[PDB]
């Protein structure tokens, strides 16, 4: 398998993880598994889901990457939490669609897939998220604030103030946040206020494994800058210096590793916000 | 040549025009000529360029055209607007970057292509169009806004409140208002308040047209709406029910038919310009 950087022809200089990365990082179908909920939540309480909407992703010698949210990361925790019941929504920053990194797409999986094909028009008609955040008050129907990873949660969402203001609601009012990877680079757009998330601890993907992949072709140039660091610099405390599919639960902060997290985060997700609402 | 949609697999049920398609309505060398301007413009006023941020256009069966800003329609004018001495910047609604139709790129072309590697960073980076617009007053130095064509024209300008307090700074501080083929959707942004280009005048793209591609592959599915018949309930006169390079000029807004149009179009704008700014 080639470890050339493949192009995406859809997009000037943009490229696509090589063969060879893809045969390293994805599979035809997932690790979902668990999803046993005999006595799911009734309410109508959803999870509302922060997306990706640009899926190119600029690198340091000016190649982009045509990135995305990972779908196994978005998808797996949703079908353990629908399974529990609680329905999601989707929000963008601009409103405009979400953008999936496709090539990892467990195209063969059987559960997943049929889940993917009978919501993809709430991840294609997404709300705006300033007009969802303009409506936010103590008795909103969301239970969580979901971030997925994928290298797109990169983009834009470190820096936006509607993130900033959910995730300050989400908080102020004992809702659960959820995130993975790369998803919790968008804590950072907490940076210019008075910070609710400082002190708290989380499992994220290592900036030291971004360092590796562009080698290998899996991205066509490196990182300008690095989530871990800053997220640190933010007060926050990253517990885990690799991959291993960790999960971790600091209060109602739910995080991941890696997309090998995936499944396990559904679970602990499930299972955490059962119990709060449980009734 | 295959009148198939072309998959493009950077998102899910995406399509490229047909190989057939792009054989009759794309060449590698643009029709670019008579940029003859020996007394340019010497001061800082600008072009302000209202682009794509999203190329995935949905089509009346649940197809996503792949689509963007058409390059010969937006580089074109511009080429010549720069030799008459007005540069340009580019916003875009989100703030994400420009779109194009790489697909309809002429790569062969011996001046439009350096002009492109020139410029091609303010289309990548972008103003969010309501920043430009919360600082706009009389003095801002902005001598037109240009909206160029291409599918991508159809998503989200026709629905902006920021393109149409662009528009309406424009129009009460006598600049130019430029466009050709779709972009004049834009004007539809107009559509719930007192609409200041009601009984103007204007070259634009046949809807007529828009509903023959499809079978030759153009566009994976039909338009959902068209914007023509809109504009004329706007109080918007269309002059031309053909496709002929035609342009227009009513009073400080420019126009043109379709990329046909795009020289032409450069060249009245830039004579238009001149002569106001002289001097
Ligand atoms: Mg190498
Ligand atoms: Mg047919």
């Known amino acids: 398998t080639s470890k050339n950087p493949q192009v995406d022809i859809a997009e000037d200089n943009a490229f696509f993880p090589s063969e060879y990365s893809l045969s390293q990082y994805t599979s035809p179908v997932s690790d979902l598994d668990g999803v046993d909920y005999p006595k799911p939540y009734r309410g109508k309480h959803k999870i509302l889901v922060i997306a990706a909407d640009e899926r190119y992703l600029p ?39 979400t953008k999936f990194e496709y090539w990892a797409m467990p195209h063969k999986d059987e559960k997943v897939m049929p889940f993917f094909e009978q919501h993809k028009s709430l991840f ?59 998803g919790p680079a968008a804590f950072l757009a907490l940076r210019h206020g008075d910070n609710p998330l400082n002190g708290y601890s989380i499992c994220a993907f290592p900036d030291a494994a971004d360092k590796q992949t562009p080698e290998i072709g899996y991205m066509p140039g490196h990182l300008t800058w690095y989530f871990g660091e800053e997220l640190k610099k933010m007060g926050m405390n990253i517990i885990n210096d690799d991959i291993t599919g960790r999960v971790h639960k600091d209060r109602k902060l739910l995080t991941g590793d890696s997309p090998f997290a995936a499944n396990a985060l559904g679970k602990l997700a499930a299972q955490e916000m059962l119990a709060a609402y449980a009734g």
């Open 59 to 97: 690198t340091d010698n000016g190649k982009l990457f045509s990135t995305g949210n990972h779908p196994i990361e978005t998808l797996l925790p949703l079908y353990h939490l629908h399974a529990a019941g609680f329905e999601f929504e989707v929000a963008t920053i601009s409103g405009l669609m």
């Open 124 to 182: 294609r008609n997404p709300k705006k998220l300033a007009d969802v955040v303009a409506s936010l008050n103590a008795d909103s129907e969301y239970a969580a604030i979901f971030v997925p990873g994928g290298h797109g949660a990169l983009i834009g969402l470190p820096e936006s103030q509607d993130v900033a203001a959910a995730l300050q609601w989400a908080i102020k009012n004992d809702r659960f946040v959820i995130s993975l990877c790369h």
